[PDB]
Amino acid sequence: RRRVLTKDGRSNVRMEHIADKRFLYLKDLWTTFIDMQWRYKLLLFSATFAGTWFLFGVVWYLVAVAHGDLLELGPPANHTPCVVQVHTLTGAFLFSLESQTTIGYGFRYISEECPLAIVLLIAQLVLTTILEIFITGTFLAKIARPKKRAETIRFSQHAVVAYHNGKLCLMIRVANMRKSLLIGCQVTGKLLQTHQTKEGENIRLNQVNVTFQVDTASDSPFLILPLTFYHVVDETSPLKDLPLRSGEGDFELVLILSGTVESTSATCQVRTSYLPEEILWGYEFTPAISLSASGKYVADFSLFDQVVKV
Amino acid sequence: RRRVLTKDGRSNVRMEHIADKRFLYLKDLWTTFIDMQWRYKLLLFSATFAGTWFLFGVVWYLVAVAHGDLLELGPPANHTPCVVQVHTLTGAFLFSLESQTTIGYGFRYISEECPLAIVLLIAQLVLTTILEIFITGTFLAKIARPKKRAETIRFSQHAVVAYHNGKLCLMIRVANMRKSLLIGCQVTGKLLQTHQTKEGENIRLNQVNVTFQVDTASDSPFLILPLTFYHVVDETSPLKDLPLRSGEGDFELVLILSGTVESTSATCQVRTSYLPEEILWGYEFTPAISLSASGKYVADFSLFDQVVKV
Amino acid sequence: RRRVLTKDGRSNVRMEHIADKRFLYLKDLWTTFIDMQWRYKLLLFSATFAGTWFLFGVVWYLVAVAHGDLLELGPPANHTPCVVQVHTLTGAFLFSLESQTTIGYGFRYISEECPLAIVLLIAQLVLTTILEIFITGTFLAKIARPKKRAETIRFSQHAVVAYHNGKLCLMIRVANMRKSLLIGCQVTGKLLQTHQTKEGENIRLNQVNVTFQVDTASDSPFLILPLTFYHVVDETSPLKDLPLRSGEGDFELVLILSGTVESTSATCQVRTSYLPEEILWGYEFTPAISLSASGKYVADFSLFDQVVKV
Amino acid sequence: RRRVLTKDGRSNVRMEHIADKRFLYLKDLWTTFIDMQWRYKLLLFSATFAGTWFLFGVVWYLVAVAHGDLLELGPPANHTPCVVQVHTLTGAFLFSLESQTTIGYGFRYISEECPLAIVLLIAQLVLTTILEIFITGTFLAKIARPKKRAETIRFSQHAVVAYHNGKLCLMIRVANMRKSLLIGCQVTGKLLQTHQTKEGENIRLNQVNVTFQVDTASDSPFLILPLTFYHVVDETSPLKDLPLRSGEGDFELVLILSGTVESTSATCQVRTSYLPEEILWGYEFTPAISLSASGKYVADFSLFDQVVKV
């Protein structure tokens, strides 16, 4: 069906008819390259390097021409070229490359004759350094993004409603698949209904906070183990008036876990959604924790999504 | 007219008569270079590189002189130079460059004769490495700045007053022009009046928080779509006593959206201002959302700033 | 005995029976390499470098072969090789190395004859640059991790119960072993009981927040000196009903200090645990602060863990 | 006199008699090098580079020896050295350098004869790369530290007590000397009294939060202009019972401004202290703001510290 967020936590919206998109993106190149697709990004990386090499090699060839350094034109035995062993396009490209990369073999080098060549070399080095820097930065930042970390954090496929501590409550379970920890883990539940004006020329979405609690409805400093979050269906519950029967209703329950990563001090936001159908009644999650002669606690993730009727 | 903040969210204040500005800036070079203008920054980049090359080349020339390595002075056939193929200023500059860049062609190299030359080379490499590092850092940081990201986030040109849920309220709309998300999005409204002491030798600015709400006056975890923020004009509203008629009054309504970026974990603060004139009465924003056979929701930003009378 | 967290603040849990672990880890390589062990990490570093060198050297050797550049096969006096002075495996490896590192001696270099060689070189440089970048990033990030900073922050070995300001309270002491500061230091106490279903096929852990206070139960902006945190045993204390006698009970008191580092703006979370036995009754911590002719305050950490009966 | 914090916001405490300091510092090298003094840091930088060069050059010399490559020992005309043009200590050092820096002149290079030399070179490159990386990181991080940014933020030299809005309150003023902004600026006031046990073998410091407010006692999103913070001396004021007369009392009023930097998303904490003497009675700060034909507001910082009697 239609859903604002994918079960995977991804957006589902398409923005359109934006004016002045191109210029704006060109203003903030950093964010642009970061958000860009991987394929075009690698293309641009390789293109930067090789195309700079190629262009400046063409320029070196032209310079060799103007100075009459080519062999075809028969330079005198006392002709000093602007650049040594550069009498062909290939050689100019190789010089450009060997320079921009700081390899510096030595078979092709500069003479003290043509200053313009020196100035050109300088410009080449400076600009290429700048571009290389910028690209390397974008690449590191695009890898470091924490979105990809959200996958090793998993929400239960199904949320379940049942009596906890005598109170009818809605419950979910969350887990971390890695040894690396989260920090300041907090959960928030949003409710999104469908407000259709008599025919759907437009839609206004109503947000309603849904508080989920663990210990005191406060926070959970660390996500050590698969935890169960629960929200109370009381007189204040915006859910109270919903069709409590399974499958009935037109609403989305979005869930958001925000927490700081320990190894990078970066924030991470996992997201997901539950539909009126996906939610289940009178079911309690199977416990997925148990002791061991280890003296250590163990988490069996096959019991994570498992549930049992009440 | 006069405004503390530009519609674009930029400051409008000029600090003056600061003592010990220069020395202070010299203490914190990092922040200085980061906040500096782009042109002077590129100038300094190029200058660092080329000028270090040039100075150390001059030094190499002087060394060649003191050792009598120049051709003009007729070194014996058994004269060993401190540096090879360095008998001119140009050659010394080229040596400096080829070294500092780690190119290393080979036509110009060092001999095992003059140690001072070796020590000098060492110093050159170390210092130039340090400077290059510092500049590269400043450059990366100056690009990564999130200010430039604020442009792809847009506030409605006009705020409007009208009855929402039966309550007279002030309303604005906000949107994100990119697919990249924000996080922990919160809004705050400040009111700034004009307190003139009988003649304007001085002015004292009174701040007054204005709370804007969406769902529960709490927060908005993610900025998926163009959202509408609204503040209630009740007995506690500092606006209550203002001249509610359009155009009347001497006050600024500053708006601030604070939120964390998803791809960089950095904070971003968008800002703007509304004047007593810019605010409009009895108008409601045109809905800019609508379904599609996509199964996806769509945002038509041409309807963003659009409004309709009530 | 069994404990969720080690006295050292480390986890004690083993997650098992995870499905699709390998592919997931391969998706997020950044986090993986960061969390990986040091030995395998250095192995991978060295392997990247040397193995890329080795493979591309093998390729260069094969190319030399196909072009008949080897000496063993007797190239004519007018035979131009794709690469110079490359007639052996060793030489090909050396060429690969000298290139990928941008050393560029010069005895072994490229000719303008074989383009395929040029294209191959290009590919080599690009890929190796990318890999080097990625590894360097992971290495920097794995060092910068703040976990290792938690060691220079120390919790008292023993917590003690006694009358403070006439109120029975539980008290602990915390200190920083360095001159570098913390920021936004806040403390939280969790209580973890043992809920065994009649036999231990499963266990459900109940979290209970325990608030610790210093001045107003608010926060402590800076961790200048060894501070004492204390929690009140009142009617609301979840501890109130515990066996207050030393050694009795089956519960863990976990302690968590969260604070921001000043020099890196990164977060840090120190953790520890106290068992019913480790806790002591009617004891007050020895003061570890005292003046000095310095005019400066001094902290004697030998008095840190020291206690005195009341 | 004695003060916990310097007027400049620096600590004044000396920690002593720490056990296992050295090993701990060696565990967390990152933080150590970051917090280290500049002089020793530059020493270590230069030492890393030059000393690695020197040691590996010594090794190359020894290798040349074992292989009998030295001239002094008269190698046959058909003797192939492990390394070319390396017959002296100086030459070995130069080879080490030219390699570790990726310069690669070419007059001194490797032969395909001695593999051990190749393996040694590999080790050298790898280790030196690692060390260079680590040092560069520490250096960048030590510069980027925001402490140094606190200097361009200034607190009023004197705090003053007087009637504001009819209420006796304590007031201070704060300013930013740069165009770069702060974010989430919040202020906290701590009160520190002197608890001497009958003779000063020990001292227990009592913290008491003092709330300072601007608009609603909430926060100040941005530090645009010199702002005045004030705290109310009411029945709840811990100051209420102090000797309100100037100069009387034994207490320190510490002030802490916490805020996020806009250009780096980093936190910054400015600190200062006021003594019972420094505080002044019945004085109000001179306004340091005034209009201009600019249409812009201006801040005259010479009026910052200025005050006027009431």
Could you provide a short overview of the structure?
4 copies of one chain form a homotetramer. Chain A is of the alpha+beta class.
Labels describing this entry:
alpha+beta; homotetramer; five-stranded antiparallel sheet; 5 helices; about 25% helix; Helix Hairpins; 17 strands; about 300 residues; Immunoglobulin-like
Task: Show the helix and strand layout.
4 copies of one chain form a homotetramer.
Chain A: E1 13-16, H1 21-27, H2 29-35, H3 38-66, H4 89-100, H5 115-144, E2 153-155, E3 160-164, E4 167-176, E5 182-193, E6 195-196, E7 203-204, E8 207-210, E9 220-222, E10 227-232, E11 251-261, E12 267-274, E13 280-281, E14 283-285, E15 289-290, E16 297-300, E17 307-309
Parallel strand pairs in A: 3-13
Antiparallel strand pairs in A: 2-4, 3-4, 4-10, 5-8, 5-9, 5-11, 6-7, 11-12, 14-17, 15-16
Helix pairs in contact in A: 2-5, 3-4, 3-5
Please characterize this protein's 3D structure.
- It is classed as membrane protein.
- The entry lists the keywords kir4.1, transport protein, membrane protein.
- It forms a tetrameric assembly.
- The entry is titled "Rat Kir4.1 in complex with PIP2".
- Chains A, B, C, D are ATP-sensitive inward rectifier potassium channel 10.
- The organism of A, B, C, D is Rattus norvegicus.
- Four copies of one chain form a homotetramer.
- Chain A is α+β, with helices and mostly antiparallel strands.
- Chain A has two domains: 21-144, Orthogonal Bundle (Helix Hairpins); 148-309, Immunoglobulin-like, CATH 2.60.40.
- In chain A, 27% of the residues lie in helices and 27% in strands.
- Chain A is built from five helices and 17 strands.
- Chain A has helices at residues 21-27, 29-35, 38-66, 89-100, 115-144, and strands spanning 13-16, 153-155, 160-164, 167-176, 182-193, 195-196, 203-204, 207-210, 220-222, 227-232, 251-261, 267-274, 280-281, 283-285, 289-290, 297-300, 307-309.
- In chain A, strands 2, 3, 4, 10 and 13 form a five-stranded mixed β-sheet that branches. In chain A, strands 5, 8, 9, 11 and 12 form a five-stranded antiparallel β-sheet that branches.
- In chain A, strand 11 and strand 12 form a beta hairpin.
- In chain A, helix 2 (29-35) crosses helix 5, helix 3 (38-66) crosses helix 4 (89-100) and helix 3 (38-66) runs antiparallel to helix 5 (115-144).
- Chains in contact: A-B, A-C, A-D, B-C, B-D, C-D.
- Chains B and D meet through strand 1, helix 1, helix 2, helix 5 and strand 7 of B and helix 3, helix 4, helix 5, strand 9 and strand 15 of D.
